[PDB]
């Protein structure tokens, strides 16, 4: 019930002012366009996927590469890091998701599983644990797989459009996905049915990510308007838009406390908003192309951004 607005509720709160984040790292070594990323729970190891058929696992602290996997196919657009750091996954338009095991053989790498059978492209694939994984298929359905068995252990139906993105709750029991129907849908990963659906958008939901408390999420549209939604509200809580530039949003993610919400546009920049007062808290610039994904460490010390420029940037 939109009896008021968040700005009215947070009126008595002063803005954080101009947020100034610095560049701590410049991860070079990628040969082609980067399409995804995921932090490990140790905030030290991260996974990056690029169209050169490569999945590279980098150590954030020491700037050096720890692992490099040559993929079967060059159309990867999503990758996820296992919370325990034992597994990685990749996949894309090939309707096949390849999963590799890390702490079984070191130095080299093994393709522990290949998930084939999808009728739609993989737009996002996400770990839940060392044995479960959720993949986004553009056939208006998603799929929950068990890596050890390789089957579509569950199918997610209810969307009427090509699913672009998803994100798990911080506790990895619930995930919200957006499709071409300009609507977002909340799902229980074990139950997989469309509980709440959010409409009103003019284009596909090109970005979606969860709030650290697992009670709210964000959406990105083509008209440069980032939107904040609550799980239970079934309506948008804040709109963060600029009229002068018409490029869409690509990725979203929140700060550890959630005072700060990050969202990148095709205008070569990312904007970080004071989530409380819709204030344009700061701008992150430096990517040599459009931003493709970004994330925050589970402990919240630093943010990583991966873009089409083939370089990852870490900000503190």
């Amino acid at each position, epitope marked *: 019930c939109a009896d008021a607005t968040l*700005s009215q509720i947070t009126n008595n709160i002063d*803005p954080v*002012g*101009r947020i100034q984040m610095r560049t701590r790292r410049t991860l070079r070594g990628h040969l082609a366009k980067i399409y995804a990323m995921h932090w490990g729970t140790d905030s030290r190891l991260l996974v990056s996927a690029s169209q050169d058929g490569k999945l590279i696992i980098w150590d954030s602290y020491t700037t050096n590469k720890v692992h490099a996997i040559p993929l079967r196919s060059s159309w990867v657009m999503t990758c996820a890091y296992a919370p325990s750091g034992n597994y990685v996954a990749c996949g894309g338009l090939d309707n096949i998701c390849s999963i590799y095991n890390l702490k079984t053989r070191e130095g080299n790498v093994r393709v522990s599983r290949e998930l084939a059978g999808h009728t739609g492209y993989l737009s996002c694939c996400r770990f839940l644990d060392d044995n479960q994984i959720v993949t986004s298929s553009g056939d208006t359905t998603c799929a929950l797989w068990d890596i050890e068995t390789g089957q579509q252990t569950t199918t997610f139906t209810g969307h009427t459009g090509d699913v672009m993105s998803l994100s798990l709750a911080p506790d990895t029991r619930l995930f919200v996905s957006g499709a071409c129907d300009a609507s977002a849908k909340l799902w229980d990963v074990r139950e997989g049915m469309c509980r709440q659906t959010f409409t009103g958008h003019e284009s596909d939901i090109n970005a979606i990510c969860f709030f650290p408390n697992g009670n709210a999420f964000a959406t990105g549209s083509d008209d440069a308007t980032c939107r904040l939604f609550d799980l239970r509200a079934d309506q948008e809580l804040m709109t963060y838009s600029h*009229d002068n530039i018409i490029c869409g949003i690509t990725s979203v993610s929140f700060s550890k406390s959630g005072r700060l919400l990050l969202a990148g546009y095709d205008d070569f920049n990312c904007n970080v908003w004071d989530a409380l007062k819709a*204030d*344009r808290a700061g701008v992150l610039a430096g990517h040599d192309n459009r931003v493709s994904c970004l994330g925050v460490t589970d402990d919240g010390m630093a943010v990583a951004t991966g873009s089409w420029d083939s370089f990852l940037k870490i900000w503190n």
Partner: antibody, heavy 118, light 113 residues
Framework: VQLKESGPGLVAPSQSLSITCTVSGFSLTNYGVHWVRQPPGKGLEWLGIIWAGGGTSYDSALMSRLSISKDNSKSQVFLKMNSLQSTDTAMYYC?????????????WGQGTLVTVSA | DVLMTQTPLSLPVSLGDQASISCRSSQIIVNRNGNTYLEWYLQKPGQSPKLLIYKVSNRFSGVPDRFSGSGSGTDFTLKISGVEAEDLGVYYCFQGSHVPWTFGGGTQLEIKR
């Protein structure tokens, strides 16, 4: 830095008032703009502020009837105030906020008297 | 809901004399980042207010040095070193720490003859 205001001198009661305080000498995306009205022969009253990034803070009494919006490209900030009353007869001032001076309103608008009468 | 109560309410001051205008809020005010915002505005009759002291004690560019800004905690004071013809008007102390921000009640400074 100069703030110049323009608005309708006479407005009918309960209608919508559109006041423009076109700013100059600074980037509107980095400074706040204030609204203060002064009834004839009385002390000042506080209305609200839009912050540098577009966030808004209003007087606790006047969130519902006051609206502050801006076009950053044109250096134009617009006050939309609805449900006007006779008590709204006042010299409405737009005041700048400078972060570098830490909440000091260096520059105030010249003010335009607005009359709510038949 | 802090209120700036200003004293003295109306004090006749001769030319060249020094005058003390102190205002104390209904509650102790400090910004959450550690700053305190007391600003003194001189308003001529019917004109827009003009800032004199920003950040409690710092004079703004163009503000005459004959105005002395100081004070701490709940006590703040603007002192005038030499009173000229341009000293006529009303003086308000302003707080910018807790919203909704509030102005002082205004001090009627008058010139004797």
């Amino acid at each position: 830095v100069q703030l110049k205001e323009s608005g309708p001198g006479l407005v009918a009661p309960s209608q919508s008032l559109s006041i423009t305080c076109t700013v100059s000498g600074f980037s509107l995306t980095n400074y706040g703009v204030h609204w203060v009205r002064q009834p004839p022969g009385k002390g000042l009253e506080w209305l609200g502020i839009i912050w540098a990034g577009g966030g808004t803070s209003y007087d606790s009494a006047l969130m519902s009837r006051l609206s502050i919006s801006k076009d950053n490209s044109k250096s134009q900030v617009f006050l939309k105030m609805n449900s006007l009353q006779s008590t709204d007869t006042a010299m409405y001032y737009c005041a700048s906020e400078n972060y570098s001076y830490d909440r000091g309103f260096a520059y105030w608008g010249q003010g335009t008297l607005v009359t709510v009468s038949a | 809901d802090v209120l700036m109560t200003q004293t003295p309410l109306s004090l006749p001051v001769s030319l060249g004399d020094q005058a003390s205008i102190s205002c104390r809020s209904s509650q102790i005010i400090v910004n959450r980042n550690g700053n305190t915002y007391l600003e003194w505005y001189l308003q001529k009759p019917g004109q827009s207010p003009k800032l004199l002291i920003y950040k409690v004690s710092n004079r703004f560019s163009g503000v005459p040095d004959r105005f002395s800004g100081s004070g701490s905690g709940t006590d703040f004071t603007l002192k005038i070193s030499g009173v000229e013809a341009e000293d006529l008007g009303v003086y308000y102390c302003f707080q910018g720490s807790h919203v909704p921000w509030t102005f002082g009640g205004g001090t009627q400074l008058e010139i004797k003859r």
